[PDB]
């Protein structure tokens, strides 16, 4: 049955509904929301693909080492004469992701941008999480 | 090995690289581009998710009953201090889809909109493809 | 043997004796106690089904981000002339659940209600766990 | 796939939706309703767990050797700010059980009690079903 | 695991705990009680092996087409110096069988004998169950 | 085929025909004869279930560390009008068990009782098999 | 047997004898002839590897959207003293490929070059297959 | 997965990348280079298919009983408007084969020809490897 | 091979060498050391079986919510004339367990007793881990 | 299911309940009691791990070539406020081992010591079991 | 396919690219970097094998209970005449390891040495992680 | 069991203990020593990773077409207070590799360098192994 | 894995470490010691292969019907310059066999010879084990 | 069938009849002859176990890099009254081993010793096989 699902290759509908992923960071949520975490020495960059989501429909909250991205995408409106004969776009409306970052961030200084359906969040690291350099002799 | 791939649940990277799907319409391409086809009595609506693609990087061409969507998404630029510790966003740059529509369209009257990373293409059906109504007695 | 257990479908007796579930919240316990966690912006609501448990037999304690629900249900008393020919109700008496919440709560302000065998616990979130809003530009 | 369901251990949602069980008594229904049948010499006791069901929402009808328990549990109301991050409580609203008793009962003298979400029904046996004693020599 | 149980060959402990057997007669019960049903033209003979059961501990009731045999065998008493190093005798105390006969019997005229741990029950058939002879030409 | 035998659950007929069991005591025989061995400091108690066996049909012989129980149960006599439609009682007539005890017994002082189809044999241990106590310091 | 073929790794002899491949273009033929199709906006380039084929032995015909490449490679001539102790080069003489292009081409303006055993065919697209550009607003 | 690879039948890309073949002659290399060895009484003929390789890009060296064929094929150049929609030609650029011949050859007298992408190498056998004739009586 | 290990039943040598167990408490170590954790309202009791360990060879350290038990058992000394023909006692000398308790303890007030090879450790809970009682209305 | 038991790694509870082990010495018993037998030229040393057993609760008897170790360990007493959240210590109370030694011992001269939960029994060999030396020429 | 990988035994290339290992310490990274953690009473020693890494290319940062080792090894430079016919050394350039230590360390007092490609890091434990000794009575 | 080893991913300990690898060059040895062979027209470069090996502990001998690398790495010294809780570094001390080169080398002119735990050996090829160039016409 | 062991064919190291063989004679021991038992009418001949064992290192003891052969073979001494590249000889030093003969022997008259590493033991049968002849009529 | 052979554990008869083993040295022969090869800087030591072989029955020949050991062991002579009831000693008479050494030896200076059934052969290495030392800088 697994090869069949792969043969159907309906990966967006079958996929991108993950409930628990551990990479040393625990991500739990619902719906399609690919996430990329890019950690610098002073901040963390989170890239989230929210295609078809309006900027006003994104609720972005963070605290400590946890980031919550809640968004709702209005489903594709169709006239009565129109009918979806084929569709790969997930129909799920309320999508969300809870991202447990590996470092504490200063949510009071965080900022986020939403361009072309790409949410880029900048989270400055807390002083308690900025690593020092161990001199090698 | 199939359950493992499902357990990894890396569906965007493993998925959304389909080469041949037949729903009575033949779609061949490369990369991540979910497509929804919504056929009316006078036109066909194609919804394509091109997150992170600039409007100038989308080449949209159509003829007869075939639609070609070519787009390139610049990869995520990172400083030398920054590093991708986790990423679900497909890294593939040049994405494309070749959609063989089930009806002939008037490409000279087609139009497309690109909002929030959602490409909506309107393709009026040709007079030779508009179906007549069979009266039932 | 798995299909047989499913064919027997004795899910309450076989089921609802979970020792370790992780949803990003770790729940460990013994016996039948379905739990629903409903997190708001200012509090957490825990719904626990304690059918046949008296209000005086429920010990509800919480601290930090951990909630302990201990309860004992007196087994079904039967006369010597009476005999259980069929039973799906779990016979286990001492049931309990240890719920590790994802946020710190103010146990000094928590409250709980027990109606129709449904335990509803209200746990206000601590100021250190209330998430701030990241403005999107 | 069976071990996986057991590993998921979501027995309430997967379980307690039995359509046909024969113990010499045929029980058919929908939803979660554990039943215990305790037969005496003069009556039959039916224990049904209806957690979260109001007494006014239980329709209890019986005739001959068949007992029908119909009940509806209002789903968990949540504010727009609140969201179910985790839930083991079955969401099914209209639950019911049709119990074919092994003996004829006098439905005109039956009684039932509903305490702590436990429905206890007393069904006196008909004179045609009260067994006589065979003296052993 | 099945061959292992057969290799262990602990058939009394593993076996003789049947809950549902249909031979056109439905037998449901608990414990070890081999049953033989020997139907004549005017009566039904039931042979039940109740080894180690006292005559006073056997409750024999019947009605219509159902026979209930309830008996309890006191477990093997042992001194503190004595210890069961090996045992094949089932330890279950309360044994019972519910036998649904294929014909209606006159329980008011039934009789039973208990010799050498063998219960022999005589159940005269009701006039409504005595079959007539179809002459063949 | 093993699950089928278990589904048939004809354990008395399939079972209780063991030819070689080792528990440190070797038991070999034919037919249905559950045995329990209960060893004290001064004697050994053997409990054998011989349902439907007459006291005159039991030949009980012992020597050294071996016990032989031979018995024959007359089969269920039936009239020509009567017919076994269902039977779980083993039809085998000549049953026997050869029990190799773990200790030497004084067969000249052994005694046995036969009540309710239960054979209880008392075998005093020989002086060469009575264990001494090792004082612990 | 599949791993064995892979272990033998005789891929040219076992491989490159495909009868039906669909990439949205249907290729049917016999023998070893790797094909690469490189579609531009105004023409289609077909690269075919015809090692050891003389230019005079290649018959190249096209019409509409179908291209037929027929060629014969003279087998390796050997003296009577010489003998093939090892060979991976396919011995098949008459090789051919029928390529159904996805667009109509102007066979009257097509050209082909044969250098180093590489056949490069240029097929200008017909005006009915040149796609127009859909302006995006 | 093996049948799938055979069903994909992408034998050139999957195949022709052999690292170790023993026919009594050991061939190790990288890339696609079918080899045929044709041994005479006085010389050895090696046929290597180097389609699309220029004569100046072939480095042919030999010594003792080992032959090394190194060649690089420039990849298929494509305009920005052109795109490979389908390709069976291996993309690997640097191909090579190390052939351990079964006989010592006089590399100072060897010669090679490169026509139609077929490399034909003539390697005269050393006097120490020319076999004598054993007269049969 | 798993049934064989179970048939060998060498569970002490094969078993009791666990490296990672999660019960909501993480235990990592080496060697045979069964652990029982018994949590009260004011303290935690840890029972560790250290058979053959001298009181002076047990190093018991704790901090925060982690308990480390290090002990070494001198191996069984044997004369040259003596030889281990059979042994189930694990030969491993340096055994240890790292127990991450679920609550913070006051290591400055902890105490432990070692009797009959049973280590009983009393760890008073910290004020920050003592749970309060939520009144139910 | 075997790998699962190994993954659970509950070897003390699953293990150490062996009923029949033959190493040329037959050991039968119940419960957890690792045994090491160390045979010298003049005696046999038996090491038994009886953790948590009081010296007064050990009954040590021997005769001929058989050793019986009977002991009972009082279960872990817990206050009503205390609860076993985790436990690897076997709960079985009455443990015993019957060891059939390979040589006859003089039980009248045997001695045993019980230190740190380790029972060490010294059993002098009988003159009939002391082996003589065969001179080699 | 697993035995094949083991038969290939290319463990460095296949291996040493671990993303998530839990020993009660969580290690996540990329590339080949064997790690040994040696915990004392006052410090933690981390041994990392960084063969072919220059001391200036190692970035060693630590904070709290997490250690990050970032290093880049310049790939093996080869002349155009030189070619890697065989290689087991991983080609990956940017290697890194993120080590979550089990105890908090004083990164301000840490030191590291790099000799013979072995990185030895000394991390003094914080006062909050130094365990006290529980006296045993 | 193979997937388990891969899941354990202990590739250094399980791996890098190869006894026989043939790439047309036969390598036999013991321990962890990744080898890269880089063959030029006039010499052979061998790169061996000997992390933690002192230059004085490497014995490098060669003759003809065989290279022997013998080295011993002193194991990680630890204080009695220190203990290896986690380790991926192979503990094997005496490592060695026997490399049969494909060409004869002039061991009298060979040289080797040992930097950062990387052994680089330069082996000039013998005149009898330097390949000549076959002119292509 | 079994075929692999057979393919490795390391039968001496894997083999000849038998712990329990029954041919009606029970042999238990450790190490490599092939045994041949050749029973005559008046004696028993035991042939044991003790290659590399000195006559002074063989301890041969017998009594009743049991024979114990204990021997130690000094391991192969090697200079520091010498190294075992290949070895099939078992490295185990202390080898032994316990042979339970089928007849009682007179150990006071037994003799043994040790030539070419072959131990030949002559054990005269006891008068109680010499069989008489049953005349056939 | 493989586990059965292992259960039979007749490794000498089944084993030690190897026809082709490659350790970089090729050993082919017949019969039981364990071989250990111990290579020094100036010689090679071959240890062969020839139990029960007379010194006059060993033919030891060597040349170049090949060693041939031929020996015949007279089978165990038995009187007509004597009979092999049990035997593990291989019955094969003519045993032999052909050992291809990795280095050329000076057979004119070789020597061999035969003590306790152990053949020790000393083979001085030829000057062409003595490896030189590559100085490391």
UniProtKB/Swiss-Prot annotation, chains A, B, C, D, E, F, G, H, I, J, K, L, M, N:
Q: Where in the cell is it found?
A: Cytoplasm
PROSITE patterns from the UniProt entry: SHSP
Tell me the Pfam families matching this sequence: HSP20 (PF00011)
> What GO cellular-component annotations does this UniProt entry give?
cytoplasm; protein-containing complex
UniProt keywords (A-Z) are: Chaperone, Cytoplasm, Stress response
GO molecular function terms here? Answer: identical protein binding; protein folding chaperone; unfolded protein binding
Q: Tell me, which GO biological process terms does this entry list?
A: protein complex oligomerization; protein folding; protein stabilization; response to heat; response to hydrogen peroxide; response to salt stress
- Main location as per UniProt: cytoplasm
What residue stretches are annotated with the sHSP domain? 26-137
- What is stated as this protein's family in its record? Belongs to the small heat shock protein (HSP20) family.
Functional description taken from the UniProt entry: Chaperone that confers thermal protection to other proteins.
Q: How does it assemble?
A: Homooligomer of 24 subunits. Forms a spherical shape.
| Protein's recorded name | Small heat shock protein HSP16.5
Query: What organism is this sequence from?
Result: Methanocaldococcus jannaschii (strain ATCC 43067 / DSM 2661 / JAL-1 / JCM 10045 / NBRC 100440)
